[PDB]
DNA sequence: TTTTTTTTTTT
């Protein structure tokens, strides 16, 4: 009854934020400057300003939304006439709806209402075009007339062809005219419920969502997203008569969120502590006793180095870690922790993986007999971390796919007439067991781990964990029992804060190596080569590839402390950890 | 509105090249020598010579492109009468269009406009034949009449047959006549975006 | 092509 365009338009112009900045007028600025055509409004902000406007949006969404969109378009038109003839429609998207429903708990009462669902994006289709206003021509020698068939409305989800010519009243043949046909961008994605919500003994459920217009290509597979929109029943084969009055539900997306100022302030305060590096290392797997050297290396892999593109070749910034340890050395516990704290990570197992599942799988579209690719584990981990457990138990045919990923950071696909090269810039963390149960110190690493030497040289660091009973057993027993009793360590950065800290560092920090750091690295290398030249009788090689690892590790240390330069201390720490690896593999100085 | 046919003809014959050599005349003569039927021109040269002509090409390529080809064809046959009876339709192609769109960035607003794409060829089908003007015969014991169904219009990409015989005004069964059907070479290729982008 | 269990030939 009461028009809400008046209260809405002044709400945009008059609204004060946390720091008294008038965000919405600032947000609407680049909407006309950069031609976004889409606006984002928080539900809490609208509710505080006027609850009547807020509750009208949730309930009467299908009616108030077109009215509100028209009001904002007029506001932009008077503010900048240049918007006309450029963008003819503006979308306003609402986020933060309190009505959040689990994927498994959707029932018939929620159809046609604005709801929000949290899940994981698993499938994305290529962008396509959908007709919303067609133009036909009547093929009848008398007629030769053109008209817009879905008059006075929009073309439904089912393409319907006119049966009677509206301009002559006769049936016959109608020809589509693509030149005058109106189109709109259209994409389809599949969302899956998070593993924490799956009940015992059940399999995860999936929901189909539709992204249209500017919402296309707003997310990548494997991302955790929050999606808001309207549920509706799905019609795909109306002509398939005969039983089956049962339909599936699909979601019509109106706004999507992936995964900000106070958090940035909190991150900066943490970096101010001189001992921030020690705090971060102590926060890695707090429930595991000892393994300080391994924890330090795992922290470096989370941040990584800086990739370099030379005149001819490319230098990866990712760090590869290989762990060999006796059974029960808590190898799998840390890898689970790493996969949970990293902003983007994929956890796999040697036995539960295949070559197609790791890189890309060809799927034949039985509906049209068409071939298309599906992203594998390594592709989904691009820009993140790939964790592989029990690498020694993987099949040889499935292991060769990893060889290219670690070396060239690429995956080559040539099958079913599809040829492509895929980026796989991901850090690889692998764990394995020795051949004969426990580890034999006297024998070299190569004959004690059951892996080809061609894959050993591709790892930046290798660590050996030995479970030898000794005087530390009492400390280990006391620590474990305290964990089972609920006792927790203090001064530990929590998972959520740690994940945000890593994401910020990987995005805004690019350390540069100073002259002093270069001299220390060079001097260590050349003196090591001279020492190694006397007697290079070790299973572990000392090739110039080790020099690149020293560069990567030093950059990671600087990035951990949010520093823009690599100083003497960072280079010194990188040498120490590299020196241990060059000697803990069974070879002395 | 303004007939650019004269402007196009003089532009080709009076194009100041790197040394005012009128290289367009040189390639036109080369085209006549080997019967190439395809003339390519640079958008920069057209814009420099007459920016108004360049805008019309890049904006109304659906309408004015056949007009320009007709003007070029008349000039070629006038220059050399032996070109007839060999090529009935010349081709003019534009290169260097400033409107460059990334393949992933294509949206609905770019449909029906002249754009350029950079990528990698992955698949190429063998050369085939496409019908652009068919001939049909009405199989109805009183007709025995032949006609070209797509009257005053090129045959659309969707093969459609007449429903009512135009010559006799009756429905029935129609048979295609391959011997009186116009054909054009047709090939399909797939382009893939570069891994860098 | 792809994962799976099965009998079969042939990688
Ligand atoms: Mg384990
Ligand atoms: Zn009609
Ligand atoms: Zn007839």
Curated annotation (Swiss-Prot), chain A:
Gene of this entry: MCM
Organism encoding this protein: Saccharolobus solfataricus (strain ATCC 35092 / DSM 1617 / JCM 11322 / P2) (Sulfolobus solfataricus)
Name of the protein in its database record: Minichromosome maintenance protein MCM
InterPro entries: AAA+_ATPase (IPR003593), MCM (IPR031327), MCM_C (IPR048908), MCM_dom (IPR001208), MCM_lid (IPR041562), MCM_N (IPR027925), MCM_OB (IPR033762), NA-bd_OB-fold (IPR012340)
SS bonds (residue pairs): none
UniProt-listed Enzyme Commission number(s): 3.6.4.12
Family that this chain belongs to: Belongs to the MCM family.
GO biological process, one term: DNA replication
Record's keyword terms, sorted: ATP-binding, DNA replication, DNA-binding, Helicase, Hydrolase, Nucleotide-binding
Outcome after substituting residue 314 to A: Impairs helicase activity
Activity regulation field: Inhibited by the cdc6-2 protein. The ATPase activity is not stimulated in the presence of DNA molecules.
Catalytic activity: ATP + H2O = ADP + phosphate + H(+)
CDD domains, sorted: MCM_arch
Subunit structure as annotated in this protein's UniProt entry: Homohexamers. Forms a complex with SSB.
Function: Presumptive replicative helicase. Has ATPase and DNA helicase activities. The latter preferentially melts 5'-tailed oligonucleotides and is stimulated by the SSB protein (single-stranded DNA binding protein). The active ATPase sites in the MCM ring are formed through the interaction surfaces of two neighboring subunits such that a critical structure of a conserved arginine finger motif is provided in trans relative to the ATP-binding site of the Walker A box of the adjacent subunit.
